[PDB]
Amino acid sequence: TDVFKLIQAHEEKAARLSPVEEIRTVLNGSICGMLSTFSQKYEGYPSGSMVDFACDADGSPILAVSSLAVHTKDLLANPKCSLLIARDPEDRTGLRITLHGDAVLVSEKDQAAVRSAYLAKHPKAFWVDFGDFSFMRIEPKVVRYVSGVATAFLGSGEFSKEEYQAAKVDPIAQYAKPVTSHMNKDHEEDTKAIVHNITSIPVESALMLDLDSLGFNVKATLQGNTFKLRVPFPRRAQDRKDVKTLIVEMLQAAKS
Amino acid sequence: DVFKLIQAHEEKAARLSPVEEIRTVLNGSICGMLSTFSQKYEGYPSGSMVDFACDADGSPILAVSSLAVHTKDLLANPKCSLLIARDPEDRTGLRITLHGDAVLVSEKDQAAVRSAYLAKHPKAFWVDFGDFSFMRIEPKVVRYVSGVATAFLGSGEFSKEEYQAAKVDPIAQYAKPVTSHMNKDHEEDTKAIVHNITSIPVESALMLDLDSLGFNVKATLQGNTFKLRVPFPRRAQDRKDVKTLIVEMLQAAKS
Ligand code: HEM
Ligand code: HEM
- Residue B50 neighbours by CB under 8 Å, 6+ apart: B31, B32, B33, B34, B62, B64, B70, B82
Query: What span, in angstroms and rounded, lies between the C-alpha atoms of B125 and B51?
Result: 13
If one counts every other C-beta atom within 10 angstroms of the C-beta of residue A18, the result is: 10
**For the CA of A70, the nearest atom of ligand 2:** 15
- Answer whether B183's CB lies under 8 Å from B176's CB: no
Identify the nearest ligand to the CA of B143 by its number. Answer: 2
Neighbours of B6 (CB within 10 A): 21
Coil vs helix vs strand at B145: strand
Q: Using only the alpha carbons of chain B, give its radius of gyration.
A: 20
Phi/psi for B236 (5° steps) reads -80, 140
Q: Do A49 and B97 touch (CB under 8 A)?
A: yes
Distance CA B174, CA A62 (A): 41
Q: From which experimental method does this structure derive?
A: X-ray
Whether the Cβ atoms of residue A50 and residue A63 lie closer than 8 Å to each other: no
> Nearest chain B Cα to A157, which residue?
B69
Collect all residues with Cβ–Cβ distance below 8 Å to A108 and sequence separation of at least 6.
none
Q: Is B186 a known ligand-binding residue?
A: no
Residue A250's alpha-carbon distances to A190, B35, B168, in angstroms, are 9, 44, 55
Ligand 2, pocket residues at CB < 6 Å: A 49, 51, 65-66, 68-72, 127; B 145, 148-149, 153, 155
What residue in A sits closest to B139 (Cα-Cα)?
A: A45
A154 lines ligand 1 (CB under 6 A): yes
* Amino acid in the structure at residue B236: A
Nearest-5° Cα angle at A75, A117 to A137? 20
HSE-up of residue A204 (Cα within 13 Å, Cβ side):
7
H or E segment to which residue B133 belongs: strand B132-146
Amino acid at B172: A
Resolution in A: 2.2
Report d(CA B254, CA A163) in Å as an integer: 66
| CA B222 to centroid of ligand 1, rounded, Å | 47
